[PDB]
Amino acid sequence: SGVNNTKKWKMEFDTRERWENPLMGWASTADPLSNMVLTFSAKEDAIAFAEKNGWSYDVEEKKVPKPKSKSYGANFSWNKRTRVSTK
Amino acid sequence: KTSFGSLKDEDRIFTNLYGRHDWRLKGALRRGDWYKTKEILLKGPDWILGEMKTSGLRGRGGAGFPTGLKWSFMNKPSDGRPKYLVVNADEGEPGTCKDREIMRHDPHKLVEGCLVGGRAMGARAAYIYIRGEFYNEASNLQVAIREAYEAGLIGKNACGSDYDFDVFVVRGAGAYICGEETALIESIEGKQGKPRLKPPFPADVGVFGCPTTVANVETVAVSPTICRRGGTWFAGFGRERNSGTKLFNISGHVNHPCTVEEEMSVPLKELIEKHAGGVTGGWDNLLAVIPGGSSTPLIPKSVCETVLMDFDALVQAQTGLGTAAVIVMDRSTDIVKAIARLIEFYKHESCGQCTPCREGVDWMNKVMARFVKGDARPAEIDSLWEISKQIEGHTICALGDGAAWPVQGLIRHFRPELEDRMQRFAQQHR
Amino acid sequence: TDTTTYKNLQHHDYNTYTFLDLNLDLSKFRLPQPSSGRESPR
Amino acid sequence: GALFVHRDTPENNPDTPFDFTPENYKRIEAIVKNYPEGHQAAAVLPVLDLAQRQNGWLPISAMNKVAEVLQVPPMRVYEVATFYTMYNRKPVGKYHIQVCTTTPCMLRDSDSILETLQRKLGIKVGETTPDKLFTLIEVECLGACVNAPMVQINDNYYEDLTPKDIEEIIDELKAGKVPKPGPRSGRFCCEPAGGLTSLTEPPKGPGFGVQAGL
Amino acid sequence: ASNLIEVFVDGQSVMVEPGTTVLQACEKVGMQIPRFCYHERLSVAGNCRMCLVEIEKAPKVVAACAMPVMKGWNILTNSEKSKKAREGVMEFLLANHPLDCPICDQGGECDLQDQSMMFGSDRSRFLEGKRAVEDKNIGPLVKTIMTRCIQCTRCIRFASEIAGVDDLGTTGRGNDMQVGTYIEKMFMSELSGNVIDICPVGALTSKPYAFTARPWETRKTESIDVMDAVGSNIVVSTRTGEVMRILPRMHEDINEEWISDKTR
Ligand SMILES: Cc1cc2nc3c(=O)[nH]c(=O)nc-3n(C[C@H](O)[C@H](O)[C@H](O)COP(=O)(O)O)c2cc1C
Ligand code: SF4
Ligand code: SF4
Ligand code: SF4
Ligand code: FES
Ligand code: FES
Ligand SMILES: [K+]
Q1: Taking CB atoms and an 8 Å limit, are A87 and B196 in contact across chains?
Q2: Which chains have 3+ CB pairs within 8 A of D?
Q3: Does B188 touch chain D (CB under 8 A)?
Q4: Distance (Å, whole) CA B179 – CA B193
Q5: Which CATH number fits domain B334-429: 3.30.300.30, 1.20.1440.230, 1.20.1290.10, 3.40.50.300?
């Protein structure tokens, strides 16, 4: 339930091929930018870095949780359907 | 007045406490119940609330919150919802039998008090949640309610005052936590006896989601006598802010354990040596007293010498006036065993809804059992104090407080007894 | 006017259905109940 | 001691024959009419208590029958039946002796009462006699503390007990008579022993001490 | 400021609507109050007592998940009383919590472990024996190890409100109160892996995912589900080039916090 990992913008790369090692069965790779994750304080900063380094980018906006009307007294309503049957 | 006690029988409210007269409608009418209650209901809600406020009656349930203000919390226009008065007849707390006595011996006082409180707050019904073990008491209450319904005091014309009121009796099924306000409301609503948080208060969202007020049986039953005799007389009895009469259940190591009606602010020594016949073996043989039921901590004989039976007096004595249940323990008492039995009672009666009470009261029960056996080291005394302080004030209801308080009282007063037991155990193993 | 004898002996001859029989007798004396507008909270 | 997990046994499967009598159905209707409309789920406790009073104990078929009568979830019925301690989810004897062992009863020596019951019935606490006549359990405070020590047998309170008194009560129950409730120490109720310290004079009567203007 | 009230979190002023809880005001400011039983899409329960915070000039700490801010309240979230309350509540949870962390599917995904490290004490005073609860068999999807359960009623509230089955609940009282089904009942509706999601402890784990991987080693890929035409946003958890798990993504306009059982 923690939200400390949803504070900073991240840039990652597209996933490339990971095959199986014939000797041990390990995950072998051929691209170097597989574990490359970059941290930014702003979407515009990530945009500037991506355009500066010449990489084509796909950007999705920050999904924030919608504000919710939480009421403890709704669990014990006279007529509404929000009354709970257990606790 | 500076000395309190010696209450007169002409001023005692529960005149049939001992069941020596008829408990039915004829006996209640002879004793003075249901007199001018139509005039009371016609004088209406604001006058009754003012009478309760000027009487200064506090809750007999435990907390003692001012009854006039608590009942005036529902002095609001209706928002399309019905309003309910609820009577807490559970009486789960140990040491207490007064509600049982007045239900089985003066039930018409309870019914008239339900009518008076329901009119004073504005209400269509009073639900009396009785303890499930009180089957004969519930049947006597239903007989009295049937008598009132046949006489026309209740139902579709409240004594001819053009007020509609219904009194229901609903039985529990064996839970001490169902004596709590919100857990009692849930138990009436048909779920488990788990207390709900505040806010919302029962004066806004209560039983079935209506405005409601849970009140003690003693409070409800002394309401119409307060209305008839005036609030000035009830306030004149007792001290300032601790007024009126009170039912004391004296039990334990006394010669005559009994339920008595006495004026408030009475000395504990005077009360015991007058009504209980004294401590078995004498006042010098007295060791400790739990003065307000098991929720309140214990007090030793040295402070029992001059202590009074007020809310404020016991607060100054680092205790409280709960259900006025005076449990007396002499020198022969195993004090640690008694307190551990109380903690075991709280372990069995906690509803387990919320983590501090659930886990910590189980923890205190285990630690108290090891303390009775002597099976620990004396740092665990301070550890148990810290555990009790963690439980107290962090729980949903006050059962966590009422379980942390006896441990705190035992650690505060009888700590050398604990340490002596613990070192005796250590030396008889090593 | 007797004060020396117990007078709760009516609780001695109570059976296991006394409370609910009294409730069933009392059901005819009561007012109609309020409705929440729903037959159940579901 | 008890477990709050149901196990399917031939005597407690959800096919044991339970059904309310027509009188019990009338009582259920009275309870539902006592509660407000749209809140018939509040009638779980009285209907379950009525089922227990009809059947003795409370089998899972009876609990499901209560659920389907009240149109409430069977899990809500199970929650109530497992939360509340007066509901017998296992068969009990004809007489269910409950000895209170909370602190004031312990001070007034309920331990001797428990020991004498154990020696008289030949059983330990929590178990039933082989003739299915007596179940003996320990309980918390039953609300009659000034009459300690005390037991509850079915719906009756037997108070101010001595070992001889509880032996006489057990003998009367074995013979099949009613032992009559109340204290056995000679006092009628919670009054002080050896005379009354209060309420000695007759009550004043109606219209005494009434304030003016009422 | 029409129909708005000013409150303070650590002295910082913030406008809130009436009915806003203390926890909601704190997360509006930007601090996440610790929680175990509160879920923003479930009903308010208020039982774990982990969201206890101190209001200024108030002697009793209040539960932020249920108490609404009144007016001008200064919520001292990082006060001594709040820290002591959090330490005590975590001590009470871990007193009877079982030492099952290496054999737990909730290895690095444990809210209990993380909130222990962030707010609880670093040692135990529990010298007694821990309780143990027998396990259940509610289905081949959700594996139940109920000894780890901390009785937060999140699964019960989810099944009552969102799944709409009314099958789970608490049986018993006190320390013996057990979450589950009283009878041997198989809890299989759709949207039934979300109890595995919202169970903070590893009491309700995924049986296909049982003993397979760890959250720190699983890589997260944000993708879309194609099992139906809802288009639920998901995370594919892949370790060493193999798809290991499917989790939901928070998208308030499509699937909120949950995915179907077929999707999962
Ligand atoms: C665990 C617990 C048990 C209680 N049991 C009772 C009880 O059996 N009877 C009672 O009248 N009050 C009981 N109370 C106190 C109630 O809160 C109180 O009686 C109720 O709010 C009515 O208030 P009053 O004292 O003004 O009438 C209990 C409180 C707690 C915390
Ligand atoms: S304090 Fe104890 S009895 Fe009260 S709600 Fe919490 S668990 Fe239940
Ligand atoms: S739920 Fe968390 S604290 Fe409990 S055993 Fe699993 S990892 Fe450990
Ligand atoms: S099983 Fe999990 S979600 Fe359910 S009450 Fe227990 S800890 Fe909470
Ligand atoms: S303590 Fe035994 S009846 Fe109350
Ligand atoms: S998060 Fe508020 S008490 Fe659980
Ligand atoms: K989980």
Answers
A1: yes
A2: A, B, C, E
A3: yes
A4: 9
A5: 1.20.1440.230
